[PDB]
C-alpha cells in the first residue's frame, strides 16, 4: 500500500523537509499533492502528469516546493504555516487511484 514518510518529521523553521513515497505504482497516469487531510482541489499544492512531466502548481503552492518523478515532495525554507497533514493522490494508468497522507511538525 502507498505510504508517505516525512524526512525529518520535526523540522526547524527555515530548513527543509522531504516527503518520501513508498510503494509507488510503476504504471502511472499522474499524481497530485495536497495541503491537509483530504483530496481537495482548493488545497492542491501541485499536479504532475507522466506524459508531459508538467508540474502544474495549484492554489496551495507557496513556490518553495519541488516535485519528482518518484512522487517525492521537497519543501524548502519551511515556515510555521507549513505544519500539519499533507495528502498524496496517485492515479494509475488504468484510472484507479491510491491515497496516502503524511505529516510533519515545524519548530
Amino acid at each position: 500500500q502507498l505510504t508517505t514518510e516525512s524526512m525529518p518529521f520535526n523540522v526547524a523553521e527555515g530548513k527543509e523537509v522531504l516527503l518520501l513515497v513508498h510503494n509507488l505504482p510503476q504504471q502511472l497516469f499522474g499524481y497530485s499533492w495536497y495541503k491537509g487531510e483530504r483530496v481537495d482541489g482548493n488545497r492542491q499544492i501541485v499536479g504532475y502528469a507522466i506524459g508531459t512531466q508538467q508540474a502544474t502548481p495549484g492554489p496551495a503552492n507557496s513556490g518553495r516546493e519541488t516535485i519528482y518523478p518518484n512522487a517525492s515532495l521537497l519543501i524548502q525554507n519551511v515556515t510555521q504555516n507549513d505544519t500539519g497533514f499533507y495528502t498524496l493522490q496517485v492515479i494509475k494508468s488504468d484510472l484507479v487511484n491510491e491515497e496516502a497522507t503524511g505529516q510533519f511538525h515545524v519548530y
Binding site: S32, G51, T56, P59, Q89, L95
Partner: protein, 353 residues
C-alpha cells in the same frame, strides 16, 4: 465533324452525372462515404480508451461529465476516477490540467461526442446525400449526464438541427480526427485488444499513422466535393443546328471544347483522389486496427470509467461497415476505369480545336 463532338459531350455528361449524382455507381460518393465510415470505425475501435476530463481553469473545479452511447448502451465518464476498493471517485483526471499528451478537457470530449453522434445519426437516418445535392435536414440527439450537488445524476438530451450533405458530415469527421491528432490524449491501460496491452503511452504514439491516414482521407474527400461542384457548374452543351455557322461560331466552338477539357480534368482529378482515399484506407486499416476496424460483433470489454447497460456493447472494433464500402469503391472505380478510353477520345477530340 458534327456528331463526333456531339457524342463525346454525351459521354462526358452521362459519366459526370453518374460520378456527381450517383451513389452505389459513383467512386466519388463511395470514397466520401468510406472516409466518413472510417472515422466512425476509428472512434468505435479505440475511443473508449481516450482519457478525458482534465481541468481547464482550476483543480478546484472537480467537474465531471458522462457521455452516453445508446442502443446494449454504454456511458463514458470524463473527470472521475475509481478508488482502490472499486467505488467511484469525483477526484480523478480533473485533478490534472488538460493539454497535449495528457488528457482532453470535457469541452474537447463533448465536441468529439457531439460530432460522432451527428455523423452516426445522419448516416443511419438519411444516409450520405449525393455530392451534387445540397442535402436533407434532420434532427440529431446527444445524451449526456452531470452529477447534481450531493444528490442524483441528471440526464440531458440535446437536439441538433443538422444536414446529411458531405460538407457538413466531413466537418464532423474532421473534428474527431483533428482533436485526437492535435492533442494526443493518453490511453487507458489494463478481451483486451492487442494495441492496449498502449497503456503508458499517448494516442498519437499508438495511432499516429492511423490518425494521419484518417486525416488525409477527410482532406481528399473534401477535395472530391469541391471538384464535384466545380464539375457540376461546368456542363458542355450539345451542338444544335449543326451547320448554322452564325449560331455555331468558331468562338463558341472553342469555348465549348475548353468547357469539355475542364469537365474532363475534374473527372480525372476526382478518380485520382478516390484512389488516394483507398490508399489512405489501407494505411489506416493495416496497423493496430487491422483485426478490428473492419468487423462488428458484441464483445464485453470495459475500462474503469465505463459503465454498460447489459454485459455486451460494441467497443473495440469498428462497426461502421467499412469493408462493404471498400469493395463498393473498387466495384464503382472498375466501371470508371473501363470508360477511361471513351474519355481519352473526348480529350483528344477537344484539343484539336
Amino acid at each position: 465533324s458534327a456528331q463526333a463532338i456531339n457524342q463525346a459531350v454525351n459521354n462526358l455528361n452521362e459519366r459526370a452525372k453518374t460520378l456527381a449524382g450517383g451513389t452505389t455507381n459513383s467512386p466519388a460518393y463511395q470514397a466520401t462515404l468510406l472516409a466518413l465510415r472510417s472515422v466512425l470505425g476509428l472512434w468505435n475501435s479505440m475511443g473508449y480508451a481516450v482519457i478525458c476530463g482534465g481541468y481547464t481553469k482550476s483543480p478546484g473545479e472537480n467537474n465531471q461529465k458522462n457521455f452516453h452511447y445508446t442502443d446494449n448502451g454504454t456511458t463514458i465518464n470524463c473527470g472521475g476516477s475509481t478508488n482502490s476498493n472499486g467505488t467511484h471517485s469525483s477526484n480523478g483526471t480533473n485533478t490534472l490540467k488538460a493539454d497535449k499528451n495528457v488528457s482532453l478537457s470535457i469541452e474537447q470530449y463533448e465536441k468529439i461526442h457531439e460530432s460522432y453522434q451527428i455523423l452516426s445519426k445522419a448516416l443511419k437516418q438519411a444516409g450520405l446525400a449525393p455530392l451534387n445535392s445540397k442535402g436533407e435536414k434532420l434532427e440529431a440527439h446527444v445524451t449526456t449526464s452531470k452529477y447534481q450537488q450531493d444528490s442524483q445524476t441528471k440526464t440531458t438530451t440535446s437536439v441538433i438541427d443538422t444536414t446529411n450533405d458531405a460538407q457538413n458530415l466531413l466537418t464532423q469527421a474532421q473534428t474527431i480526427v483533428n482533436t485526437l491528432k492535435d492533442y494526443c490524449p493518453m490511453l487507458i491501460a489494463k478481451n483486451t485488444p492487442s494495441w492496449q496491452t498502449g497503456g503508458g503511452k499517448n494516442s498519437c504514439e499508438t495511432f499516429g499513422a492511423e490518425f494521419s491516414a484518417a486525416s488525409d482521407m477527410i482532406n481528399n474527400a473534401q477535395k472530391i466535393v469541391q471538384e464535384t461542384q466545380q464539375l457540376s457548374a461546368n456542363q458542355p452543351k450539345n451542338i444544335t443546328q449543326p451547320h448554322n455557322l452564325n449560331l455555331n461560331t468558331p468562338s463558341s466552338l472553342t469555348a465549348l471544347a475548353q468547357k469539355m477539357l475542364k469537365n474532363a480534368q475534374s473527372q480525372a482529378e476526382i478518380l485520382k483522389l478516390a484512389n488516394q482515399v483507398e490508399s489512405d484506407f489501407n494505411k489506416l486499416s493495416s496497423g493496430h486496427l487491422k483485426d478490428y476496424i473492419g468487423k462488428c460483433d458484441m464483445s464485453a470489454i470495459s475500462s474503469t470509467n465505463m459503465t454498460m447497460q447489459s454485459q455486451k456493447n460494441n467497443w473495440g472494433n469498428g462497426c461502421a461497415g467499412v469493408e462493404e464500402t471498400l469493395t463498393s469503391l473498387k466495384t464503382s472505380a472498375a466501371d470508371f476505369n473501363n470508360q477511361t478510353p471513351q474519355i481519352n477520345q473526348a480529350q483528344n477530340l477537344a484539343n484539336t480545336l
